[PDB]
Amino acid sequence: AMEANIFCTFDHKLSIADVGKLTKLVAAVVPIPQRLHLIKHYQLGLHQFVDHTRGYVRLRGLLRNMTLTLMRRVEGNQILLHVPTHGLLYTVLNTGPVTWEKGDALCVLPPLFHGPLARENLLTLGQWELVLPWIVPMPLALEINQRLLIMGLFSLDRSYEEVKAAVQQLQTITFRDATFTIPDPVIDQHLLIDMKTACLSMSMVANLASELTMTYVRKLALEDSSMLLVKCQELLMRLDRVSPDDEIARLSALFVMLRQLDDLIREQVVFTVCDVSPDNKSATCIFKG
Amino acid sequence: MDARAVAKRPRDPADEDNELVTALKAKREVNTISVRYLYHADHQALTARFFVPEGLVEFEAQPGALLIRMETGCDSPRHLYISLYLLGIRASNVSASTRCLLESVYTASAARAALQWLDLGPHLLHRRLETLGCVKTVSLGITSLLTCVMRGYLYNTLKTEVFALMIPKDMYLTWEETRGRLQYVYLIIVYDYDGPETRPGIYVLTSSIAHWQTLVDVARGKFARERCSFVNRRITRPRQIPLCTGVIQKLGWCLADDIHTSFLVHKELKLSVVRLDNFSVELGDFREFV
Amino acid sequence: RVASGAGLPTSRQTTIMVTKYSEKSPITIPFELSAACLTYLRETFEGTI
């Protein structure tokens, strides 16, 4: 009567105290890059995806196409992992730094903390370090995405002081008994390529919308059939106060910048809480994939 | 590993005994607890348990009603579980007669506090409403205990009675005269961005359409006036950021034949409702559109 | 534990493991033996009463 379980081993000589460190992480969701059956421990967590060169939201895009197992049982020489299926309930540990409550829509985010921190004593080897994805509720995830994206938008004008105080304002967030702070996406007054592609795509779709749409709705008024369409170009006239293959190229690049933004503008709720354990360390959630 | 292991017949749960029976039977003891039939083993519906103050559990002694947790910017009571009927004092869709009926049953302390908390923030409703699903039992204390149903059917213990989802008549809305073999149910919040009020209209749609684009293309065709109201308050009042004219989440699905009109009586207040007898709850996120 | 009523807060499974230690307290009472006594105890002298 065994369940479908993916077995993961370890190649290093894991000591007894390190297993005892590992045994606390029972209901901790760990991603998997590829649904194998027996997998090495180098592909268990985000430390196969750690890149000092690349940014943060590239990891958010690469977390979408993972497989998010749960540590079913920890013992000697192999670790059990449980692939969840849609509809059955599972316990999840609060590996994220945010408190949870009954019925919150949970979403999975790459951890905004890494390396040296007073609570980042994690499962570590000589070169391997286990890092866990964050599990935060839905509106906090939306707000964090907006904060990091706006802080990426201020990457060029950082020399002024109003922008610096704005970065100090956006970098922190108050939540339910949370004085949480995020890291800044810029380091050493130059921006990483992930955030640069994100803000470039957003600025491009905003600029192309500000360029094409007046001409298109002005062309649409000849074949106008709804009063919703004539009044929308009126506000374009209010706000404002070529080769055809290039026009096709402009529309195509607009849709390319639209396609390169779905990793930011939406996210799927993964868990929702049925019950939270007392002291908020764990909770019981149904799956929703 | 051999031929007989794969050639073994599949396992049925009711044929084999429970865990506790074969645990006690080995060491040869018998206790006063009867363990030969263990309840709630064959219960596919995922459920939970939530507390609620007494001020909200009117129109709730009947089993089967929607339950949406609403947000609250405080710290201690910061989450509160309100029924759909108590949200009826906020919908502009509700007529005056039904509103004066159901506001005359929530004349307690905490009901008006949730009424004020809905109309005190800078945000909309669907940025403060989170659906939990449907109840199936009460407990009726001074702090009543409810059992909500998260995913699956609604039934009693021992499955002897199928509870039915109730929705009031004003929020009901169909867009076809010929219902299919199935029709899903959706929860529609559509905002009226008119001058003195942004008080939305709450609707529960029972449609046979499944794919979401093929739902929103008729959602625009049924709520065009509110779209014009949204763009009108956008062009009229700049330096304001309106958003999400209509928000739709999938509530669940039904059988498209047991849907009939009924009523609930409570404190001799007859309220005409729509009764969905075999409703299976399948919650979804508040998907937003324009 | 005890069984409460419906809706009242119940009583959960409780495991408690404590540990009693052990102290230590040595004692010592010395005693002197004079060199005259130790000389006249083990050594044999001439045959006198």
UniProtKB/TrEMBL annotation, chain A:
InterPro entries: Herpes_capsid_2 (IPR002690). The gene is UL85. Keywords: Capsid protein, Host nucleus, Virion. GO terms for molecular function: structural molecule activity. The lineage of its organism: Viruses, Duplodnaviria, Heunggongvirae, Peploviricota, Herviviricetes. It comes from Human cytomegalovirus. One of its GO terms (cellular component) is viral capsid. Pfam families: Herpes_V23 (PF01802). This is Capsid triplex subunit 2.
TrEMBL record, chain B:
InterPro entries: Herpes_1 (IPR004999). One of its GO terms (biological process) is viral capsid assembly. One of its GO terms (molecular function) is DNA binding. Keywords: Capsid protein, Host nucleus, Virion. Coiled coil: none annotated. Pfam families: Herpes_VP19C. GO terms for cellular component: viral capsid. This is Capsid triplex subunit 1. It comes from Human cytomegalovirus (HHV-5). The gene is UL46.
From TrEMBL, chain C:
It comes from the Viruses. This is Major capsid protein. It comes from Human cytomegalovirus. The lineage of its organism: Viruses, Duplodnaviria, Heunggongvirae, Peploviricota, Herviviricetes. The chain holds residues 99 to 147 of 1370 of the full protein.
